Amino acid sequence: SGFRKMAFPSGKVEGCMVQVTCGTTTLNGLWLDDVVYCPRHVICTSEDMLNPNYEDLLIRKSNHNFLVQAGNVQLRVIGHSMQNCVLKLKVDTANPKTPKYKFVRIQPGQTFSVLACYNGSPSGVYQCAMRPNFTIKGSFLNGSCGSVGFNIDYDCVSFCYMHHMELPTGVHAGTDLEGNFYGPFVDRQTAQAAGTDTTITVNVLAWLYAAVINGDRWFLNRFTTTLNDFNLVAMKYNYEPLTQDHVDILGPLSAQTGIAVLDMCASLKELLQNGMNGRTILGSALLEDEFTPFDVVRQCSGVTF
Amino acid sequence: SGFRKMAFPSGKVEGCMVQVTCGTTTLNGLWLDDVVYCPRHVICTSEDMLNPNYEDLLIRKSNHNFLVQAGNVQLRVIGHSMQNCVLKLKVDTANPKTPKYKFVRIQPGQTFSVLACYNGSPSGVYQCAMRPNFTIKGSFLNGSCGSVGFNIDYDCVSFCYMHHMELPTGVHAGTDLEGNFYGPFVDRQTAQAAGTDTTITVNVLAWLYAAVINGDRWFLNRFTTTLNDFNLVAMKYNYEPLTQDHVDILGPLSAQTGIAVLDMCASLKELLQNGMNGRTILGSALLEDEFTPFDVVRQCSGVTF
CATH class of the missing domain: 1.10.1840.10 (main proteinase (3clpro) structure, domain 3)
Structure with missing residues (x-):
């Protein structure tokens, strides 16, 4: 008896969290097999976020500009590309802690657990829902971008969310792990208001x-x-x-x-x-x-x- | 921004959860170094719980009566003893996943995360408090006994709770990891009512x-x-x-x-x-x-x- 707001045990995802630094910006990435997934805005300065041209910004970046650290496990970046609003960083080592996983894009109304992380290090876990207006009501401070949302079914971790943006109303917007935003939101600091909650x-x-x-x-x-x-x-x-x-x-x-x-x-x-x-x-x-x-x-x- | 009910990441504790079976009863245990900690009522039948004499019940048990399984890692029990309301099962293998840890006894008002487990397998994680009347308001079904509550400070897992009992009012009672109940509760199916919440x-x-x-x-x-x-x-x-x-x-x-x-x-x-x-x-x-x-x-x- 009793009923609580109950997250999935987070261990399987904890083992996949890394730090990604590009020049001045540090956020979180997700290391699965020999790929690290992270928000593409890791390549942006503060000022860039007002109106970034990501293809142009990325032309100035090479593999060696991306510094990826798993704990102190320092990873070697051997390729990069952009897919929608995420970057895929191919590394030379497959994550040994990679759980069985899939990528899913969830529907509004579905719930998932979030592992809030900073600088590659997980801080806490809580449960939330994709709202009908395609925001989530999370708990995210500066540095939390790249934290992920997931569901676990026995062996399998289904990743459904990567954190990208906080709106002025203090609610949260992000992408599936293919880099497509949920709802109409963009990775630009702009006038973006949420619809009806x-x-x-x-x-x-x-x-x-x-x-x-x-x-x-x-x-x-x-x-x-x-x-x-x-x-x-x-x-x-x-x-x-x-x-x-x-x-x-x-x-x-x-x-x-x-x-x-x-x-x-x-x-x-x-x-x-x-x-x-x-x-x-x-x-x-x-x-x-x-x-x-x-x-x-x-x-x-x-x-x- | 945002503020959520936020549990500690559970990975460090997930790695310590095992299944303990004694005759007919299966619950959870906590494997730290070469000791497994579990509720002493693992030795009781349903009927025993109305008025158990634990010293006498335990006389009928030897090391080999305790079956301990870590996933399928089958552990060999080489000693047992009772400490208050917990059993300590010495095994022949130190848990390789043992985190840095301590045992603390918390005060009413303090909060902690619970990793709810069944048959040695963690199901979810949520955050709760030691109530002033020394109950907790949890989410526990049959088989969850031996699930633990904890806090994490950087490297260190401070274990503070082990689940033992559900009261008739559907609130929860248990022990610190030395086996002393919080509050006046006992590991007997009896008239035990909670004080003022x-x-x-x-x-x-x-x-x-x-x-x-x-x-x-x-x-x-x-x-x-x-x-x-x-x-x-x-x-x-x-x-x-x-x-x-x-x-x-x-x-x-x-x-x-x-x-x-x-x-x-x-x-x-x-x-x-x-x-x-x-x-x-x-x-x-x-x-x-x-x-x-x-x-x-x-x-x-x-x-x-």
């Missing part, structure tokens, strides 16, 4: 199922609803529209608890319309949306890696 | 300082207070009494923000008396008390290990 409805519902499993039961009511009726309410409260696909994903949690998905939607509708009345659910005074159905099943059944 | 006042204040550092500023008011006046209020709301020692610990955060500790106490007093009025602080609708002053400084300055 909508609530991930299917995650809220998952968390209510988690709540029930733990004896937090007060919000169950007498009511049901329909998808269309519930969605009128979601729209008012800037919640994502719920689809039958979402209902299907919640099927296992429904089956476990014997609470029909549409009955849990009717509970959620009442919470939206009436609030919490100063009560709490799983230690929260607001409706939490950064646990997925899969997250709830994992934590409630003790899946290991 | 009081709020860790100095942690709340630390978190308000964290909030200010991030632009969450709305709760700053015109008022000040005194220690004695504030404490009349703390008592009403089942908050720990604030001491001058606590004020001193908050000195760095005061100096950083230029907000006097007693002025932040006056802000907290208003939040207690008036509530949040449906507003949020650092993504929370209630006053968070599981970040220490040291936690806030760490996360706000990017300390690494």
Whole structure:
């Protein structure tokens, strides 16, 4: 029992973190096999970031301009290229600590763990979600660029995020490990504002199922609803529209608890319309949306890696 | 920017987790140098836990009755003993992944990371606090006993907790790594109720300082207070009494923000008396008390290990 915001164990990723320095700029890179991946803005000065031409800036760089350090394991750079907004630095040594891994591009609503690092050295780990507006709500200070987000399924680390930018509103933007930004964001210090921070409805519902499993039961009511009726309410409260696909994903949690998905939607509708009345659910005074159905099943059944 | 509930990177501890089986019971152990530490209740059946005599139960056990597996690294048990509520299993091989470590017994109010494990295999990591009533609010399923709590300072892992028991109220009890329970709890399935879940006042204040550092500023008011006046209020709301020692610990955060500790106490007093009025602080609708002053400084300055 109990339910916590739970990150993946970080050891497999810790072993892949390196420091990358190019002239004046130090950030983090990810060493997998004989390639180091890092943000391309490692080649930029502060002033360059107002309007960088990355192809032109990179013409002034050779392999030897990139200093890569794994702890004190100093790595030899033997090739470089740009792929979208990441650099790939080919080194002469394959990382011996390389875990089984894949690169995935996640959808808004999906959750992942972040290993926040500075100067190649991991500082902490926390859990977050790709928001519907394609930002993440992280914890990143200067030097954290190149820190990565990931999921682990038994043997396999699925890397989904590399940190690149903090927006003026203090939320975070970055890329998949192919270097494509999530959402419309760019690696330029510019006017980039985030869209609506909508609530991930299917995650809220998952968390209510988690709540029930733990004896937090007060919000169950007498009511049901329909998808269309519930969605009128979601729209008012800037919640994502719920689809039958979402209902299907919640099927296992429904089956476990014997609470029909549409009955849990009717509970959620009442919470939206009436609030919490100063009560709490799983230690929260607001409706939490950064646990997925899969997250709830994992934590409630003790899946290991 | 941003502020998250942030665990220590778990790799150093992942390398120390093993499976311990004695007859029918499998839980987790911690392998440091040539010793495996685990809950003594590994020797108990379900039925034994209603009223175990551990010295007598252990008379029926020899070294070969303890099966210890590190991944598939099968370890050879060459000695055993009981120390308070833990068993120490001497093995014939020193763990090659042993980090620099110490054993500490923490005070209520202190925070630590937990690596939740099953069958010797780590599942996730989250951050929690020793509550004033000496319980922790964790996430533990059957098989998680022997999972550990720790802090990391650069090179050194300070182990402070080993999980032993879930109480009927779904909160958690356990030991330091010398096997002494925190609080009055015992390793027997009995009537054990938790005392008052009081709020860790100095942690709340630390978190308000964290909030200010991030632009969450709305709760700053015109008022000040005194220690004695504030404490009349703390008592009403089942908050720990604030001491001058606590004020001193908050000195760095005061100096950083230029907000006097007693002025932040006056802000907290208003939040207690008036509530949040449906507003949020650092993504929370209630006053968070599981970040220490040291936690806030760490996360706000990017300390690494």
